[PDB]
């Protein structure tokens, strides 16, 4: 610690906060693979329909 008024020379202040960036998990999926759903807690059942030739 300096014994003189070093606070006088603090003539510039820069504060680093960052920014909320896009999650990196988006790089692991294609744009078509992600589809939002309306839910907060519990379970949701999804039905896949299928066809075949007899």
């Amino acid at each position: 610690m300096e014994l003189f008024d070093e606070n006088y020379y603090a003539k510039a202040v820069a504060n680093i906060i960052g920014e909320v960036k896009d999650p990196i998990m988006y790089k692991w999926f294609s744009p078509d693979q992600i589809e939002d759903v309306d839910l907060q807690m519990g379970y949701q059942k999804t039905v896949k329909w299928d066809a075949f030739l007899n």
């Binding site: 896009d22 988006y26 790089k27 744009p31 992600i34 939002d36």
Partner: peptide, 28 residues
């Protein structure tokens, strides 16, 4: 936003728009 529910919906829409913009601007 009139109320907190609308504020939350706006936040969700903003997040979705950010995801869409990121995928549009992404080049692999």
């Amino acid at each position: 936003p009139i109320n907190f529910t609308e504020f939350v919906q706006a936040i969700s829409n903003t997040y979705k728009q950010r995801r869409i913009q990121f995928y549009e601007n992404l080049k692999r």
